[PDB]
Amino acid sequence: SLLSLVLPDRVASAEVYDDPPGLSPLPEEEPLIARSVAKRRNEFVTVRYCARQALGELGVGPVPILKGDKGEPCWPDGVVGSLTHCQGFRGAVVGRSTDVRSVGIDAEPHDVLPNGVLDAITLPIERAELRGLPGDLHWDRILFCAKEATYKAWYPLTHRWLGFEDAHITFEVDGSGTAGSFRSRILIDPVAEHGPPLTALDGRWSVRDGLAVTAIVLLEH
Amino acid sequence: SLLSLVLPDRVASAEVYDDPPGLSPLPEEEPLIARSVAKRRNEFVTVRYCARQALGELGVGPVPILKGDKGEPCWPDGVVGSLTHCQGFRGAVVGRSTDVRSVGIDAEPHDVLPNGVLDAITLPIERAELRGLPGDLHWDRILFCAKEATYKAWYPLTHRWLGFEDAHITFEVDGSGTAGSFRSRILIDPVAEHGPPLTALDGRWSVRDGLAVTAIVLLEH
Numbered sequence: 001s002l003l004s005l006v007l008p009d010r011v012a013s014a015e016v017y018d019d020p021p022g023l024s025p026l027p028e029e030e031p032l033i034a035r036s037v038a039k040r041r042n043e044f045v046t047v048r049y050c051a052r053q054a055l056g057e058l059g060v061g062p063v064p065i066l067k068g069d070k071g072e073p074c075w076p077d078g079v080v081g082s083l084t085h086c087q088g089f090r091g092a093v094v095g096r097s098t099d100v101r102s103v104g105i106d107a108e109p110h111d112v113l114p115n116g117v118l119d120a121i122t123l124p125i126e127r128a129e130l131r132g133l134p135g136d137l138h139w140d141r142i143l144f145c146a147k148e149a150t151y152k153a154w155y156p157l158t159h160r161w162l163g164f165e166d167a168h169i170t171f172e173v174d175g176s177g178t179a180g181s182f183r184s185r186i187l188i189d190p191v192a193e194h195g196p197p198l199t200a201l202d203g204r205w206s207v208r209d210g211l212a213v214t215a216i217v218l219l220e221h
Numbered sequence: 222s223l224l225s226l227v228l229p230d231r232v233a234s235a236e237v238y239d240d241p242p243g244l245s246p247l248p249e250e251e252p253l254i255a256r257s258v259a260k261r262r263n264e265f266v267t268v269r270y271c272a273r274q275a276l277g278e279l280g281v282g283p284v285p286i287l288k289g290d291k292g293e294p295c296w297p298d299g300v301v302g303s304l305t306h307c308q309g310f311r312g313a314v315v316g317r318s319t320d321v322r323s324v325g326i327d328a329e330p331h332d333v334l335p336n337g338v339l340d341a342i343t344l345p346i347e348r349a350e351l352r353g354l355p356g357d358l359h360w361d362r363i364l365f366c367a368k369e370a371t372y373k374a375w376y377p378l379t380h381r382w383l384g385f386e387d388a389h390i391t392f393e394v395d396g397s398g399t400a401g402s403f404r405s406r407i408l409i410d411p412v413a414e415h416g417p418p419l420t421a422l423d424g425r426w427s428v429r430d431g432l433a434v435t436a437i438v439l440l441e442h
């Protein structure tokens with residue numbers, strides 16, 4: 001699994017690389033995609049099939065996963081998690097809220113960013129630091145995935161906007177040259193609605209099978 | 222009502238000015254606010270009481286209003302609408318999809334914008350044009366409201382991001398000095414999922430009772 005390369009043992013994950021046949025929303029989810037085009041319906045249903053497989057590994061039965069503030073997923077009591085879908089990937093990660101405070105994941109095609117996007121998503125200091133990272137890796141795309149995972153882990157604990165310029169992400173590469181760690185240093189007020197302040201979020205990144213994947217798992221102390 | 226000052230006929234509106242006692246979510250809505258702090262629970266529940274009053278006026282029984290892509294409200298079959306909540310205001314507008322293509326509304330306290338917001342939401346040309354507008358009005362705040370109503374009317378028809386810089390808003394002021402019209406000229410690809418391109422959205426604005434309110438109601442062709 002691509003997500004096993006960026007996750008700890010305390011969470012369950014499930015992923016697919018396509019839209020498997022015969023998948024349906026649960027009845028409670030139907031209104032969220034009643035008006036959605038085929039591509040949106042597919043990713044929504046497929047990623048929630050993945051979520052319910054991962055929930056099953058936690059000993060949680062099939063439940064609907066609705067959407068709340070700014071699109072955040074709505075987990076059953078005692079569960080936290082994150083969802084992501086891009087071209088060739090749907091993935092879900094869940095953990096017990098007794099062991100895990102927040103999860104944020106992202107997956108993107110491992111390709112150069114469209115012209116203009118890098119400058120829009122970076123601090124000057126990030127552009128400099130990227131230029132000195134090693135490997136034939138699309139560091140622009142990897143940075144984008146890390147910013148996205150950071151927002152997904154941050155938002156359920158704060159319900160505040162985190163802009164691209166509001167986190168400074170630094171990367172470390174493990175011996176493989178294709179995976180490692182990142183740290184997101186939060187540059188804005190770090191007060192959380194629950195648990196300790198979010199001054200910094202540590203995560204993992206991996207580039208494998210034409211995808212960049214990032215995950216942050218914030219643990220309950 | 223404050224919303225009646227910015228609306229045509231064939232839409233229903235409802236509003237209140239606080240969070241009254243004696244309100245509950247519908248049971249299908251409970252998951253959306255199950256982890257929410259009181260201020261968020263209260264605004265969510267009150268604005269949906271408003272939405273159900275406006276639906277009742279239109280002839281639609283009380284239904285849950287869930288959230289979909291990027292937080293967009295999920296309306297019942299044959300209905301479009303918009304919701305807003307700020308300090309001292311909750312309001313809802315709904316129409317039949319047979320009369321109305323889309324609806325966007327916004328309400329803000331009529332106060333100067335907080336630091337840095339005006340520059341984040343404007344083109345250079347807009348900052349120039351706003352300096353030219355007449356009256357002791359917070360034109361920075363009214364522009365923010367018109368950009369918010371624009372995005373809410375646009376998003377359901379496109380499912381594409383509209384940045385604050387992707388819409389050029391121009392205002393008219395009526396002889397009252399506290400109401401008028403605006404036009405939002407769209408600067409990105411205007412193609413809709415159905416019907417004619419969204420090249421420009423026309424709306425109304427009003428300042429009354431310490432609030433700025435904006436509404437766009439788009440015609441069903």
Ligand SMILES: Nc1ncnc2c1ncn2[C@@H]1O[C@H](COP(=O)(O)O)[C@@H](OP(=O)(O)O)[C@H]1O
Nearest residue numbers: 044070071072073083084085086106107152155
């Ligand atoms: N504000 C937010 N906080 C955390 N997760 C969010 C979020 N808004 C959206 N998400 C999650 O991000 C998912 C999409 O991830 P990505 O954009 O990387 O493919 C959404 O999938 P769904 O819309 O299917 O629920 C949703 O579950």
Ligand SMILES: Nc1ncnc2c1ncn2[C@@H]1O[C@H](COP(=O)(O)O)[C@@H](OP(=O)(O)O)[C@H]1O
Nearest residue numbers: 265268291292293294304305306307327373376
């Ligand atoms: N992408 C989107 N498109 C249209 N309406 C949206 C939207 N995201 C959020 N909204 C609506 O805007 C409301 C909030 O408006 P405002 O920010 O002006 O107070 C939300 O209220 P709820 O979160 O209570 O559903 C939701 O109904």
Ligand SMILES: [Mg+2]
Nearest residue numbers: 043084085086
């Ligand atoms: Mg996706």
Ligand SMILES: [Mg+2]
Nearest residue numbers: 084106107148
């Ligand atoms: Mg993503």
Ligand SMILES: [Mg+2]
Nearest residue numbers: 264305306307
């Ligand atoms: Mg609000």
Ligand SMILES: [Mg+2]
Nearest residue numbers: 305327328369
């Ligand atoms: Mg608003």
